[PDB]
Structure 1
Amino acid sequence: DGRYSLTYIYTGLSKHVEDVPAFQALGSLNDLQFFRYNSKDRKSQPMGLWRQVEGMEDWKQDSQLQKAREDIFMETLKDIVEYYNDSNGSHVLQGRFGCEIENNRSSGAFWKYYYDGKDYIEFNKEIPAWVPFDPAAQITKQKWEAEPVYVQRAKAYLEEECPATLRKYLKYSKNILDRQDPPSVVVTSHQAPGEKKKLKCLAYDFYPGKIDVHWTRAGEVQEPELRGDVLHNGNGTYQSWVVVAVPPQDTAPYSCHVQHSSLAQPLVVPWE
């Protein structure tokens, strides 16, 4: 088995904007979004290829779970805004949480909040405790640690419930998540007549996103002067590219290397 993750982004606004739900929720399996929810419709909706999967989750039931989470989340926002007494300005709270498994063993988890884009509070499950980054998070910390069972429940969600949901979802999502699309490659060059040649290598049309694209000079990896990535959200493919500068007096042979999980071995594309 490989690495899999289940992650969530919850976002909440203190100030109503027309046609924008105050509370918005997104869930992801690896880099693919599988469900959404908002405060207008108040319904857990599957997304993408999970619209055609049956039995993974009871979405009607999960909508009740999300309503409950909405109320506690928005109450936390309300408390922060009341702490600063800016009850007429626009403010945002974002919570992010999730877990990971590799080789079917838990390999990570996190649970963090941001207020107006800055670190607010995070759960450190190894202590265990909520760690505040902002004066107002002292009040939130104390509500969430008012009884010694709350911390243990928080730890247990990250270490037991989140991985159990992930393992459940994998039995239904394995084909979707194990998609292997191999990269195609394009190599480019340009130069002023007798000056530094710029060589660019681009891998594209690939999934999953993890990849290593690099130039070698006679086998030795070169440091790019420029690099970049692309994600086409629609078809769910990626691209990744690097540029190196080659002195006009450099005669060594350059190749582009592409290491990706869909390949038996790295693609090596010489530039001649």
Structure 2
Amino acid sequence: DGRYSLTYIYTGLSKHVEDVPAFQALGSLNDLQFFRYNSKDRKSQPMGLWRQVEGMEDWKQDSQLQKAREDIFMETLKDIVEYYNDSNGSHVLQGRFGCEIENNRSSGAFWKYYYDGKDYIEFNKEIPAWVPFDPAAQITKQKWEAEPVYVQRAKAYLEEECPATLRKYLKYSKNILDRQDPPSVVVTSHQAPGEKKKLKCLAYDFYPGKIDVHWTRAGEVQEPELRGDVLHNGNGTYQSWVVVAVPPQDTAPYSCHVQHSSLAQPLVVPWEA
């Protein structure tokens, strides 16, 4: 088949305000987020299109898995902070890990951490072993490879467990991930006195995100003055817009051109001056 990826992002704060949960976890399949979890509610909740999907995962049991990871992740953050002697400062530890398959064949995986935005430590499953980037990561590298077993386990997760889990979610998610929802396009305009007229083209409610939206002046592609696009996760749809500035006297016709995988033919919307 095609490419599919399973991704997780853990974020921990040494010091956080009351609303703000100290630990936050989120998972994604391709471009969409299918679940979340935070240190406050301590609950693994499905998201977007998966909110209606049942049997894919035991959210109760996963909530326990996260609670575990949390304790561990946060403790690591604790140690690091201790190293730099700033136990009472605001710091962040971010973990990102996952795998991906292409043609039903494992095609990669990763596991990396970021302390305060900087690269901290990263796992190389081909060695297998961790790679330090930050001085403290050396201590952490130490601990994490204390027993020969550890590195083996890590390699296993990425090469075995992760992909396995990806496989199962696919059984419940392929559809969501495979959608070919065409974009609706709308042309709009703005005009302030003493300024060039601005034409805006908006493509929306489409999926996948890959799309081509551009303006043409009498048939010649026009470089946009402003671009912009968004993903609405709970929804599963994208929105991409482009704005051109049309000179005062210009009479050349302006049309918006939208190309997308779900469309057999490019969609063209002219601007009726």
TM-score range for the pair, normalised by the shorter chain length: 0.7 to 0.9
Do the aligned partners of residues 214 and 84 (structure 1) sit closer, same or farther apart at CA in structure 2, a change above 3 Å counting?
Answer: same
Q: How does 1:101-250 map to 2 (within 5 A)?
A: 101-188=101-188, 198-216=198-216, 221-245=221-245
In the TM superposition, residue 228 of structure 1 has moved relative to its aligned partner by 0.9
Assess if the C-alpha contact under 8 Å between 2:212 and 2:260 holds in 1.
yes
1:36-85 deviation digits (Å, cap 9, x = unpaired):
22334433222344333222122232223222212221121111011011
Give the alignment's TM-score, normalised by structure 2.
0.83
Is the alpha carbon distance of 1:183 and 1:151 closer, same or farther for their aligned partners in structure 2, counting shifts above 3 Å?
same
Alignment identity in percent? 100
Conserved? CA contact 2:49–2:234, under 8 Å: no
CA distance in 1, matches of 2:166, 2:209: 20
1:192 Cα shift?
Answer: 8.3
Residues 265 and 154 of structure 1, relative CA distance in 2, 3 Å threshold: farther
C-alpha contact 2:190 2:199 (8 A) present in aligned 1: yes
Does the 8 A contact of 1:207 with 1:238 survive in 2? Answer: yes
Number of residue pairs aligned between Structure 1 and Structure 2: 272
Contact 1:12–1:22 under 8 Å retained in 2: yes
Mind listing any 5+ residue stretches in structure 2 that lack a counterpart? none
TM-score, L = length of structure 1: 0.84
Gaps (5+ residues) in structure 1? none
- 2:29 maps to 29
Work out whether residues 194 and 248 of structure 1, in 8 Å CA contact, stay in contact via their aligned partners in 2: no
Cα root mean square deviation, aligned? 2.9
> Can you list the C-alpha shifts for 1:84-118, whole angstroms capped at 9, x where unaligned?
11112222211111222233233332222112233
User: Which deviates the most, 59-68 or 126-135?
Assistant: 126-135
Say if 1:126 and 1:223 are closer, same or farther in 2 by CA, change over 3 A. farther
CA distance in 1, matches of 2:251, 2:151: 63
Give the drift of 1:165.
0.6
> How far apart, in 1, do the equivalents of 2:267 and 2:92 lie?
45
Do the aligned residues in 2 keep the contact of 1:255 with 1:270 (CA within 8 Å)?
Answer: yes
Q: Distance in 1 between matches of 2:77 and 2:229?
A: 35
| Structure 1: distance between partners of 2:80 and 2:180 | 44
Is the contact made by 2:49 and 2:235 (CA closer than 8 Å) also made in structure 1?
Answer: no
Is the 2:47–2:234 contact (alpha carbons within 8 Å) kept by the matching residues of 1? no
Contact 2:256 2:270 in 1 (8 A): yes
Shift of 1:23: 1.8
Task: Classify 1:61/1:230 alpha carbon distance in 2 versus 1 (closer, same or farther; 3 Å).
Answer: closer
Shift of 1:254: 4.8
**Which deviations, in whole Å up to 9, do the C-alpha atoms of 1:196-247 show, x marking residues without a partner?**
6654322122222221212345766443332111333443432112234566
**CA 1:75 to 1:244, structure 2 compared with 1: closer, same or farther past 3 Å?**
same
Structure 1 residues 49, 231: closer, same or farther in 2, change over 3 A? closer
Q: 1:193 and 1:46, CA in 2 relative to 1: closer, same or farther beyond 3 A?
A: closer
The structural deviation recorded for 1:128 is 4.2
- Note closer, same or farther for the CA distance 1:254–1:139 as it changes in structure 2 (3 Å cut): same
How big is the shift at 1:136?
Answer: 1.4
Are the counterparts in 2 of residues 213 and 257 from structure 1 also a CA contact under 8 Å?
yes
- In structure 2, distance between residues paired with 1:109 and 1:220: 43
Q: 1:257 to 1:125 in 2, by over 3 A?
A: farther
Paired residues of 2:56 and 2:168 also in contact (CA < 8 A)? yes
Q: 2:196 & 2:74 partners in 1: Cα distance? A: 57
Q: How far off is 1:264 after superposition?
A: 1.8
Moved more, 167-176 or 17-26: 17-26
